[PDB]
Amino acid sequence: RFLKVKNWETDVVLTDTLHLKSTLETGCTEHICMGSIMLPVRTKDQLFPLAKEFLDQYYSSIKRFGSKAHMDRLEEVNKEIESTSTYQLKDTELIYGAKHAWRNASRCVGRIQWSKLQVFDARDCTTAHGMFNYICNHVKYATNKGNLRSAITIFPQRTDGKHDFRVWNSQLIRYAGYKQPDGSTLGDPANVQFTEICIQQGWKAPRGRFDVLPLLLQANGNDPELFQIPPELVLEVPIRHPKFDWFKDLGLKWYGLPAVSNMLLEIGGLEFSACPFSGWYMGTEIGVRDYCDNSRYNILEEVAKKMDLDMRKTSSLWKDQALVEINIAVLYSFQSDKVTIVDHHSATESFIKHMENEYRCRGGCPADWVWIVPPMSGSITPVFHQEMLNYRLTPSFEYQPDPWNTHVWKG
Amino acid sequence: RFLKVKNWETDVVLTDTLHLKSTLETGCTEHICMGSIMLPTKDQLFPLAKEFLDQYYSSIKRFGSKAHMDRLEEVNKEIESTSTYQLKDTELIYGAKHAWRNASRCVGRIQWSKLQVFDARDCTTAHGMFNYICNHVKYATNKGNLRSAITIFPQRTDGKHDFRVWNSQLIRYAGYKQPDGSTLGDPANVQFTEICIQQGWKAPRGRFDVLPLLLQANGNDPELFQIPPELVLEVPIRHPKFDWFKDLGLKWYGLPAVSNMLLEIGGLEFSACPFSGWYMGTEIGVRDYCDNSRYNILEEVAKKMDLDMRKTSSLWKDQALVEINIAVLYSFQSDKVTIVDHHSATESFIKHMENEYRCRGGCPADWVWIVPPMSGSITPVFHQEMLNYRLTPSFEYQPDPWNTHVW
Numbered sequence: 001r002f003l004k005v006k007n008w009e010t011d012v013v014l015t016d017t018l019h020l021k022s023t024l025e026t027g028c029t030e031h032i033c034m035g036s037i038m039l040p041v042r043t044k045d046q047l048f049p050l051a052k053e054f055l056d057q058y059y060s061s062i063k064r065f066g067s068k069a070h071m072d073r074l075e076e077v078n079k080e081i082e083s084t085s086t087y088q089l090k091d092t093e094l095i096y097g098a099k100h101a102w103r104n105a106s107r108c109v110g111r112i113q114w115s116k117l118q119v120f121d122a123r124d125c126t127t128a129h130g131m132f133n134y135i136c137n138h139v140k141y142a143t144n145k146g147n148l149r150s151a152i153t154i155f156p157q158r159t160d161g162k163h164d165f166r167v168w169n170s171q172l173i174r175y176a177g178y179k180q181p182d183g184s185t186l187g188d189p190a191n192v193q194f195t196e197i198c199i200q201q202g203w204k205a206p207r208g209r210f211d212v213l214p215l216l217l218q219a220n221g222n223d224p225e226l227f228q229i230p231p232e233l234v235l236e237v238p239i240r241h242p243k244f245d246w247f248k249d250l251g252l253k254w255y256g257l258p259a260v261s262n263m264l265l266e267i268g269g270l271e272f273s274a275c276p277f278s279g280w281y282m283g284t285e286i287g288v289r290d291y292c293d294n295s296r297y298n299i300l301e302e303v304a305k306k307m308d309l310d311m312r313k314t315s316s317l318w319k320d321q322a323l324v325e326i327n328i329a330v331l332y333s334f335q336s337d338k339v340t341i342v343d344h345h346s347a348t349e350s351f352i353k354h355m356e357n358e359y360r361c362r363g364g365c366p367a368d369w370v371w372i373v374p375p376m377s378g379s380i381t382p383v384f385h386q387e388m389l390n391y392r393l394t395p396s397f398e399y400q401p402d403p404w405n406t407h408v409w410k411g
Numbered sequence: 412r413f414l415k416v417k418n419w420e421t422d423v424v425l426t427d428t429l430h431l432k433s434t435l436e437t438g439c440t441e442h443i444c445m446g447s448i449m450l451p452t453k454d455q456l457f458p459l460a461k462e463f464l465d466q467y468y469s470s471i472k473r474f475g476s477k478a479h480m481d482r483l484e485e486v487n488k489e490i491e492s493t494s495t496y497q498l499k500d501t502e503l504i505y506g507a508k509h510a511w512r513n514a515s516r517c518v519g520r521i522q523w524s525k526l527q528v529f530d531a532r533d534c535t536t537a538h539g540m541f542n543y544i545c546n547h548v549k550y551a552t553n554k555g556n557l558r559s560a561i562t563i564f565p566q567r568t569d570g571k572h573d574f575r576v577w578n579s580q581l582i583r584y585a586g587y588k589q590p591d592g593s594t595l596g597d598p599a600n601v602q603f604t605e606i607c608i609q610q611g612w613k614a615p616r617g618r619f620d621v622l623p624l625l626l627q628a629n630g631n632d633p634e635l636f637q638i639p640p641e642l643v644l645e646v647p648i649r650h651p652k653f654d655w656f657k658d659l660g661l662k663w664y665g666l667p668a669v670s671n672m673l674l675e676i677g678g679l680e681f682s683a684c685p686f687s688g689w690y691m692g693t694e695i696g697v698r699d700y701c702d703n704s705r706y707n708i709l710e711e712v713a714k715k716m717d718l719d720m721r722k723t724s725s726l727w728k729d730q731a732l733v734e735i736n737i738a739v740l741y742s743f744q745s746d747k748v749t750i751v752d753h754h755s756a757t758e759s760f761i762k763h764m765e766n767e768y769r770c771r772g773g774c775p776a777d778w779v780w781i782v783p784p785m786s787g788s789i790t791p792v793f794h795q796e797m798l799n800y801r802l803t804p805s806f807e808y809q810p811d812p813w814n815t816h817v818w
């Protein structure tokens with residue numbers, strides 16, 4: 001089978017054969033597409049196949065397919081699984097695995113960078129204090145005083161599902177949200193429930209608009225523990241605008257390091273339930289979503305108010321006007337402070353080049369159009385006009401349930 | 412099989428039962444989503460007809476009635492005897508409204524029940540087709556107060572006698588490839604413009620030349636007609652604050668009227684069914700004007716605004732895009748030609764989708780097409796999970812006739 005994808009701007013046509021390596025399911029059927037749905041304890045049985053399939057990929061990538069080293073490693077993993085019911089990855093396999101989970105992440109527009117990933121093997125970690133130390137080193141290494149470097153830290157894999165390592169924060173660095181008695185929210189409304197859990201666990205909340213949350217860390221299935229990231233390790237950027245002097249007085253800032261901490265990394269059948277990873281921002285993640293979603297900081301009105309836009313009718317495009325200015329301000333601020341950031345024009349152009357290169361050398365690039373297209377200015381970016389095929393390859397990053405829903409408290 | 416969609420901004424959760432009536436296939440499988448792909452006998456005819464008449468009689472609350480049974484029997488006899496059948500006027504009107512109600516890529520469906528249907532099944536010649544079309548254009552334009560309409564020409568018989576409107580829309584501008592190497596006018600219309608010229612059209616060779624209609628009746632070779640110029644309402648584009656904007660020399664037409672689709676009702680195929688509503692501003696301001704392969708005007712507008720074009724991160728493109736779209740909306744509003752902005756349209760679509768979930772058990776919606784091509788996430792449709800599936804009656808895309816037609 002060959003599937004073709006067209007670009008409607010360039011008329012470039014690509015042929016995908018890689019989708020033939022897909023096994024996981026999409027959510028879609030013959031009768032129903034679920035492409036815009038956000039969300040569409042293993043035994044030995046399922047395991048050796050997953051292991052073998054991963055190891056065959058690994059050994060092909062390094063041009064050693066079928067070699068003695070390849071065969072002995074299959075043999076070795078086979079026997080490890082029968083004797084212990086699981087197995088351990090070699091460092092080189094873990095690194096290759098983590099790189100490929102990113103390469104395979106179909107909602108990631110930043111994948112041109114996939115092969116440049118610093119992998120911190122934290123599989124020797126046993127306690128939450130150990131996790132905290134690991135995460136500080138990650139944050140410091142990745143921050144690099146503004147010159148951001150992609151990185152991932154990988155904690156011990158799942159065993160019986162009763163001893164999971166988990167980072168309870170959704171990202172390593174986020175701002176607290178506090179729901180007020182009058183129904184308004186102070187700070188980030190996306191973090192209210194998590195902030196409540198931190199408070200209940202003993203965090204002394206400053207109750208401001210940009211309070212960096214404490215890490216809440218679960219090791220070996222134990223109850224999680226609170227730690228404050230050292231403030232000197234949290235790089236932040238005050239947001240100002242190049243032409244509008246009043247913009248700074250909105251009191252806005254953001255942190256420099258985007259670091260997803262709630263996902264599951266699957267490599268060769270093994271499950272790494274705590275695998276925080278970080279890169280750098282595309283400007284719209286902050287300027288469009290973080291600042292301008294109604295359920296987030298929601299600053300559009302106040303900005304358009306300061307700009308004296310005609311707010312009487314939507315068709316003055318006052319929201320679109322304020323939206324561009326805010327996004328200009330975020331890119332300007334990060335740039336002036338020398339904190340790595342990419343704009344959505346540059347990021348999407350790089351992605352199309354990456355995607356074409358992947359079609360040529362790999363036979364495809366799974367891509368989720370719903371997520372890859374930026375949330376402003378969609379059609380003046382080259383990805384809008386690009387047909388994409390979304391399917392699931394392993395190694396992979398997966399969503400997992402928030403741990404407060406599933407954790408059995410020990411006391 | 413019983414599905415939930417969530418809006419992530421409002422936490423509103425809707426249950427879809429309507430997908431169970433899904434009929435056609437999507438392009439997707441359990442292994443590959445094709446959500447972003449643009450194009451993903453008497454035996455079969457009776458099931459198709461019954462399925463339709465059942466939903467018709469159910470809609471008028473006479474399901475299982477004597478009138479229902481009698482009609483089903485009537486239609487059955489007609490197929491076995493004549494190999495096809497004819498829709499009653501009421502069935503045609505119902506079917507056309509429902510094909511619009513079912514159009515998963517249409518954001519304007521809150522309007523679906525207010526559709527004027529023109530029954531042109533009595534038409535026999537291209538000249539007749541032209542007369543019907545002018546009347547459609549004039550009815551729908553309504554001196555700027557636009558009214559939704561569809562004109563339905565005779566159904567396909569043996570496939571050798573198709574009615575087709577060769578144009579993709581009733582009103583579009585010509586495109587000409589130049590000795591220069593650049594394109595004059597609308598680059599999307601170069602091939603069709605050459606067919607017009609090949610067929611006799613004397614092209615003015617300008618940037619905004621309304622194309623002639625190329626009409627095919629009873630599967631004959633198509634013929635050329637000019638829409639009377641006084642029936643084509645156009646809007647000159649100016650900006651409310653930039654004096655220089657009008658000097659770009661831009662205009663657009665008021666009536667968007669898609670004329671290349673196939674309407675399928677109860678298994679019958681209406682290969683010529685041009686239909687029209689009114690524009691959402693972004694369709695012109697973002698796509699017609701700013702697409703690289705369309706009028707591609709971003710650079711020239713950016714220049715007159717004196718923006719910093721040295722680096723993409725000044726967001727000059729985004730700035731210019733907003734002003735072009737302000738100018739479109741302003742111009743149409745000033746000349747009193749119906750238009751809707753993308754905020755207002757997507758808000759109405761969210762209201763429409765809620766009515767539909769409550770009253771019909773779902774609403775098929777293609778998120779990739781529903782979300783406007785600028786400012787995605789400040790419109791409510793961005794945060795709204797949607798299920799896409801194919802219900803009949805339906806509008807379908809069909810092969811350009813020049814690739815099909817034996818001359």
Ligand code: HEM
Nearest residue numbers: 102105107108109110113150151277278279280281282397
């Ligand atoms: C080099 C800098 C990177 C940039 C500019 C970038 C860009 C982005 C953006 C804009 C998104 C969508 C996020 C959203 O809308 O919430 C995303 C998603 C994602 N990226 Fe990246 N990315 C980068 C690096 C990384 C790294 C290092 C990884 C892991 C190794 C990664 C894996 C993912 C995954 C798994 C998603 C989907 C997340 C989800 O489902 O919530 N990306 N990327």
Ligand code: HEM
Nearest residue numbers: 511514516517518519522559560686687688689690691806
């Ligand atoms: C009343 C005002 C209407 C508005 C504001 C509107 C809005 C839109 C928009 C913005 C699109 C996307 C088109 C594109 O991006 O190229 C679209 C597509 C479409 N609409 Fe509507 N619509 C209207 C009326 C109608 C009517 C009257 C019909 C049929 C009776 C219809 C059926 C369709 C179909 C079948 C599509 C998809 C066309 C394709 O696949 O190329 N719409 N609509």
Ligand SMILES: Cc1ccnc(CCCCCO[C@H]2CNC[C@H]2Cc2cc(C)cc(N)n2)c1
Nearest residue numbers: 038039258259260277278279280281282285399
């Ligand atoms: C490494 C990197 C580089 C550049 N940017 C980033 C930022 C990613 C931040 C992710 C925040 O996304 C949050 C907010 N909305 C959906 C949610 C993530 C999510 C939610 C759900 C239900 C499913 C899913 N797959 N992913 C990370």
Ligand SMILES: Cc1ccnc(CCCCCO[C@H]2CNC[C@H]2Cc2cc(C)cc(N)n2)c1
Nearest residue numbers: 449450667668669686687688689690691694808
């Ligand atoms: C009735 C109405 C109301 C408001 N707006 C409109 C404008 C729709 C104009 C149609 C323009 O669409 C053209 C340009 N890009 C895709 C193409 C239509 C199309 C192309 C293809 C390959 C498949 C498909 N289903 N539809 C029509």
Ligand SMILES: C[C@H](O)[C@H](O)[C@H]1CNc2nc(N)[nH]c(=O)c2N1
Nearest residue numbers: 036037038370371793794795796
């Ligand atoms: C409902 C819909 O799938 C949801 O709003 C999606 C759309 N596209 C997105 N794209 C990105 N990058 N991030 C998101 O959170 C979303 N949200």
Ligand SMILES: C[C@H](O)[C@H](O)[C@H]1CNc2nc(N)[nH]c(=O)c2N1
Nearest residue numbers: 384385386387447448449779780
């Ligand atoms: C490849 C992708 O499907 C294509 O560019 C789509 C995206 N969304 C669209 N949405 C609308 N309304 N109209 C279009 O023409 C397109 N083009």
Ligand SMILES: [Zn+2]
Nearest residue numbers: 028033439444
């Ligand atoms: Zn799909």
